[PDB]
Design a protein around this ligand. Structure first.
Ligand SMILES: [K+]
Ligand SMILES: [K+]
Ligand SMILES: [K+]
Ligand SMILES: [K+]
Ligand SMILES: [K+]
Ligand SMILES: [K+]
Ligand SMILES: [K+]
Ligand SMILES: [K+]
Ligand SMILES: [K+]
Ligand SMILES: [K+]
Ligand SMILES: [Mg+2]
Ligand SMILES: [Mg+2]
Ligand SMILES: [Mg+2]
Ligand SMILES: [Mg+2]
Ligand SMILES: [Mg+2]
Ligand SMILES: [Mg+2]
Ligand SMILES: [Mg+2]
Ligand SMILES: [Mg+2]
Ligand SMILES: [Mg+2]
Ligand SMILES: [Mg+2]
Ligand SMILES: [Mg+2]
Ligand SMILES: [Mg+2]
Ligand SMILES: [Mg+2]
Ligand SMILES: [Mg+2]
Ligand SMILES: [Mg+2]
Ligand SMILES: [Mg+2]
Ligand SMILES: [Mg+2]
Ligand SMILES: [Mg+2]
Ligand SMILES: [Mg+2]
Ligand SMILES: [Mg+2]
Ligand SMILES: [Mg+2]
Ligand SMILES: [Mg+2]
Ligand code: NA
Ligand code: NA
Ligand code: NA
Ligand code: NA
Ligand code: NA
Ligand code: NA
Ligand code: NA
Lengths: 159, 52, 103, 50, 203, 125, 119
RNA sequence: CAGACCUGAGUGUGGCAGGACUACCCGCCGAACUUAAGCAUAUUACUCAGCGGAGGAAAAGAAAACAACCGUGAUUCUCUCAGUGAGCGGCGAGCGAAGAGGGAACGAACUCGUUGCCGAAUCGGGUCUUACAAGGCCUUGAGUUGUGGCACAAAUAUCAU
RNA sequence: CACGAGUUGUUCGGAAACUGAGCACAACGUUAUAUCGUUUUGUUAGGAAAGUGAAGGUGUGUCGGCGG
RNA sequence: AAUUACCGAAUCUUUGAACGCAAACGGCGCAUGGGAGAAGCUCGUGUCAUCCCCGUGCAUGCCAUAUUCUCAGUGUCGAA
């Protein structure tokens, strides 16, 4: 089928032609051993699901209704920053201890500037092998980038 | 000059010497072109009008 | 003025080929793996006349290199081709009249 | 002759049914203006050509 | 925000990295069809500016138009009358290629409402535009105030009537005041006003 | 006279209506024989009352069926699969048009601005 | 990956759920019993028609022009309780269809003609 | 191996397009007769014919607008500007507007993207409430390659109770 | 001209059910414009257009055969 | 149960954008509900092969969708 031929021919001339440094940097990914450990830390601080978030807010509502005078915190448990808009703000405000960027984002212009933005802000970053593996860690289908803003005390040595 | 991997059949093509016989008749030219195409008889341009 | 008859002939219309009663295009057999590496043996089955062509045509019977069936090519016969002749087509074919060889 | 489509035969059949004179009692109605059929047809005068 | 980096990235279109990215895409777009439906826009920042939202009922298509000027379709390049109207190759269509791409999409799929379009690529022989279309029968579209208007019937085939942004461009509606007096509200509306003969009752 | 009253027809069941329909269709067919074989003028005057009684029988049968089927599909679970013949016709445009509910959809900011600054009724002295 | 023995790709056969049956869009009440009255309209009482009754055991009827020869045989059974061993049909030059219905020897065409009322 | 997600097929389910009308209106395409006492630029005319597309009107419309003032204030229309000491034109035949001014109308204004603060609070689909609720509950289904909320000059918080 | 009639098929002609010179729906491309082009030289379409199915496995019916 | 006028409930043949496929053919289908069935089986009752009749769905494209349906790719991974 024409789509089978064109996806294979695509890969051929991404190697035949001279690729500038801004795109070649995504073919030089983090090694497998460190990629697995990073994904395990991202999965440990994955965002809460729809069910988990709504049960937490339901409890917070009850603790609010127990005494309307006192204010109950609605803060979510510590997790990773996920999403192009939110991860970018963590870099610009310099709240990200580490940023994990996926190498196969298409269009590449979504994240082509993340290595240069992290480098300008002196923020550790890594380009990893799949955006679906990043999505699996956080519980979605795909993920362009993930930032770790903080970890618990028992996970500071791992970070 | 052609690539050496192009094929050729040995010998001459059959039916040679056909042009050697006079046709002698406008009717024999009628049957020769009946299997070829519509190109005969041939009017000379000097015998036409300036419009054509 | 009006259109010249030589230009009118490029439209097709009544100036096309009288292809009815023609057997078809006369061609060598496909340059397949057997042709490129070994040879294919065929048998001349008939010598035919095609309307509008002055050279004789030959129907040569080959076996299918991959399937259980016959192929029946049709090519322009060289002079001396006879019915029952064995035709060799390929790299390893001998230099005899009627054989198809690489140049 | 013998061949005709059934659709053509059915148009010719309606034209045959319309080729009748006005009934006599139509002329005796109160505000009547019809005396003869003005749409009479003869096969030799006018052709339907169906 | 992240938009600021995609916006400034697409202003450096002649850079080496962007010339590489566009060369792989233009090669790929050549071996596709004239109209191609996409799950997601090639430029999400540009699509969102022009009305696209990642909601149910928003569609993106990539449409191909052949580049070059308009050749007048006269037999054998033979034209009659005053020599002023004798040109065949040098004349140019009074409608831009973005409007032609929108109209070719809209005529092909009449169940969709064309909203906008944007430039994504051009090659020596082709130009590619991505057209945002909306489904009027979608419940999400029909309950959203920000896109509710397109369900109305005045917006049927608005691209065929020159009402899209590309159509407004070649109508001269980018300009106002003394740059647009003869073409406002339309060239025919201005013509009728200047050329109709007025007969006041008492005169 | 062969005139079926509509009030009497609307009290019959579907079985009695179909039995009456067969009885009137059979008697109309016997009157078509009388048309060919001469026939009394008083007998040929019974054709029109019968043909309209057949129409009355078929009107009650079809009016009952449509209202019974409209009640069946009025259930909340069956409203999606209602046959288009039983749906409201209106007009092609009115069926595709935005409803009053969807037309009046407002954003959160639009609703708040209409609550903050409602239009007032006033006069001048 | 798979092994393909043909020189070109063809679409694989996947699971196809069959189409469901919708609620009927025709809800008009149609009586099965009165359908025979549409097939058989009325008899013909001309000289040729009367001639065939006595000697050919044949009844001549004007029928539906779209009616079938097999349907005319069934309608004669429902309406007149007779068996037709042969039906010959022609579409008349005025558009009507006339049927030549021959009854079995068990049935007298004159007796059934009297019951119809064409005597 | 499985498996994923990217791209793309097949089928089921719910819908839409298709044609008519086309006076007016919107987009394109587009003559020539005629006038110039000839004719080619010009005129007829950015018109007829041709191809598309809507509606009860359409289109336009909330300043990247006029002006040059003591300043006006979205659009559309009318008188007027003005057959013009504007201008265009074998500067010939001919063509030819705009600001201002008196009025009609006018509750006339809003929405998104962006930027800051949030971050699925969003949308479909089931089921319940007399309800295909702008509602509750559930739902990976879609969406984090971002939809929704708050504030951006008619402004100086919103978010609790 | 008026009125009334007349055309009867398992086998006759056609269709169901063939190919020809050819046409041009789909598909694709083109065109401001599809109302344009390609569409039989074995034959559509950058083209995933086969819904049909040899053997074999699973049960039903109709049997032959061995043993009890 | 007059007849007129008006309209809320209905009927609405063959076609036609015409759309199962065709067409100087009132032609030919595939799925699914029925109907009638004088052969055969059963005890004129039931049932009913071939044949015949009728309702509904079935064009192409697009959008959305799937109790989250079935698949393809020397696309990217990931595990073997
Ligand atoms: K005529
Ligand atoms: K004006
Ligand atoms: K459908
Ligand atoms: K003159
Ligand atoms: K507008
Ligand atoms: K004013
Ligand atoms: K005969
Ligand atoms: K065509
Ligand atoms: K039955
Ligand atoms: K694969
Ligand atoms: Mg000749
Ligand atoms: Mg001469
Ligand atoms: Mg004759
Ligand atoms: Mg004739
Ligand atoms: Mg032009
Ligand atoms: Mg016959
Ligand atoms: Mg003159
Ligand atoms: Mg002259
Ligand atoms: Mg002009
Ligand atoms: Mg016109
Ligand atoms: Mg008005
Ligand atoms: Mg409007
Ligand atoms: Mg103003
Ligand atoms: Mg004056
Ligand atoms: Mg002018
Ligand atoms: Mg937004
Ligand atoms: Mg006569
Ligand atoms: Mg042919
Ligand atoms: Mg050809
Ligand atoms: Mg091909
Ligand atoms: Mg049809
Ligand atoms: Mg059609
Ligand atoms: Na030819
Ligand atoms: Na004859
Ligand atoms: Na010319
Ligand atoms: Na139309
Ligand atoms: Na004139
Ligand atoms: Na004014
Ligand atoms: Na007569």
């Amino acid at each position: 089928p024409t789509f089978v031929t064109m996806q294979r021919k695509k890969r051929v001339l991404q190697r035949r032609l001279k690729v500038p440094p801004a795109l070649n940097q995504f073919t030089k990914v983090l090694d497998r051993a460190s990629r697995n450990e990073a994904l395990k830390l991202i999965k440990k601080y994955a965002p809460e699901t729809r069910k988990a978030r709504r049960e937490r807010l339901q409890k917070v509502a009850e603790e609010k209704k127990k005494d309307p005078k006192k204010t109950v915190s609605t803060k979510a448990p510590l997790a990773v920053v996920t999403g192009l808009q939110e991860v970018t703000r963590a870099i610009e405000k310099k709240q990200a201890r580490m940023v994990v960027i996926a190498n196969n984002v298409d269009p590449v212009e979504l994240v082509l500037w993340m290595p240069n933005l992290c480098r300008a802000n002196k923020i550790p970053y890594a380009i990893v092998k799949d955006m679906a593996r990043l999505g699996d860690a956080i519980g979605r289908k795909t993920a362009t980038c993930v930032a770790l803003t903080d970890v618990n005390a028992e996970d500071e040595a791992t970070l | 000059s052609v690539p050496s991997t192009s094929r050729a059949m040995i010998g001459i093509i059959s039916g040679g010497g056909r042009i050697e016989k006079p046709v002698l008749k406008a009717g024999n030219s009628f049957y020769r072109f009946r299997g070829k195409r519509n190109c005969w008889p041939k009017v000379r341009g000097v015998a036409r009008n300036p419009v054509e | 003025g009006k259109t010249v008859l030589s230009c009118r002939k490029g439209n097709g219309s009544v100036y096309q080929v009288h292809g009815h009663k023609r057997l078809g295009p006369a061609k060598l057999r496909i340059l397949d793996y057997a042709e490129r590496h070994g040879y294919m043996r065929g048998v001349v089955k008939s010598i035919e006349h095609e309307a509008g062509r002055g050279a004789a045509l030959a129907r040569v019977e080959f076996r299918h290199p991959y399937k259980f069936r016959r192929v029946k090519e049709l090519m322009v016969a060289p002079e001396g081709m006879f019915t029952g002749q064995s035709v060799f087509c390929g790299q390893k074919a001998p230099l005899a009249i009627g054989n198809v060889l690489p140049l | 002759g013998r061949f005709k489509p059934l659709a053509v035969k059915k148009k010719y059949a309606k034209k045959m049914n319309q080729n009748k004179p006005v009934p006599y009692w139509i002329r005796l109605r109160t505000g009547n203006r019809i005396k003869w059929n003005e749409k009479r047809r003869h096969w030799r005068r006018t052709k339907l050509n169906y | 925000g992240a938009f600021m980096y995609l916006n400034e990235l697409w202003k450096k279109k002649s850079s080496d990295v962007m010339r590489f990215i566009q060369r792989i895409r233009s090669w790929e777009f050549r071996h596709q069809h004239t109209v191609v439906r996409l799950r997601r826009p090639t430029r999400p920042e540009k699509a969102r500016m022009l009305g696209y939202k990642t909601k149910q009922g928003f569609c993106v298509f990539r449409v191909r138009v052949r580049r070059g000027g308009r050749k007048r379709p006269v037999h054998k390049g033979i034209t009659y009358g005053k020599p002023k109207t004798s040109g065949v190759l040098g004349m140019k269509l009074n409608k831009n290629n973005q409007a032609v791409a929108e109209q070719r999409l809209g005529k092909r799929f009449g169940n969709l409402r064309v909203l906008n379009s944007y430039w994504v690529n051009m090659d020596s022989t082709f130009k590619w535009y991505e057209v945002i279309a909306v489904d009027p029968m979608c419940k999400t579209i029909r309950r959203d105030p920000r896109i509710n208007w397109i369900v109305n019937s005045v917006h049927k085939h608005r691209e065929q009537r020159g009402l899209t942004s590309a159509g407004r461009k070649h109508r001269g509606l980018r300009h106002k005041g003394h740059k647009a007096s003869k073409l406002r509200p339309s060239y025919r509306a201005a013509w009728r006003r200047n050329n109709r003969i007025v007969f006041l009752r008492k005169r | 006279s062969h005139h079926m009253k509509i009030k009497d027809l609307r009290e019959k069941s579907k079985d009695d209506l179909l039995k009456t329909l067969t009885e009137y269709k059979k008697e109309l067919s016997q009157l078509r024989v009388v048309q060919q074989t001469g026939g009394a003028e008083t007998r040929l005057g019974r054709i029109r009352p019968i043909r309209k009684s057949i129409a009355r029988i078929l009107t009650v049968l079809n009016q009952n069926e449509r209202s019974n089927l409209k009640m069946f599909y009025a259930d909340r679970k069956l409203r999606c699969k209602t046959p288009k013949v039983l749906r409201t016709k209106l007009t092609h445009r009115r069926r595709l048009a935005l409803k009053e509910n969807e037309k009046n959809r407002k954003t959160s900011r639009q609703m708040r601005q209409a609550h903050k600054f409602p239009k007032r009724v006033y006069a001048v002295k | 990956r798979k092994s393909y023995t043909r020189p070109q790709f063809r679409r694989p056969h996947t699971y196809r759920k069959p189409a469901m049956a919708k609620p009927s869009n025709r809800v008009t009440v149609e009586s099965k019993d009165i359908a025979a009255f549409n097939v058989i309209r009325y008899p013909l009482t001309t000289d040729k028609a009367m001639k065939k009754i006595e000697e050919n055991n044949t009844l001549t009827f004007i029928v539906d022009s779209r009616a079938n020869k097999t349907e005319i045989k069934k309608a004669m059974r429902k309406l007149y309780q007779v068996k037709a061993v042969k039906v010959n049909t022609l579409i008349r030059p005025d558009g009507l269809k006339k049927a030549y219905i021959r009854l079995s020897a068990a049935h007298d065409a004159l007796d059934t003609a009297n019951k119809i009322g064409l005597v």
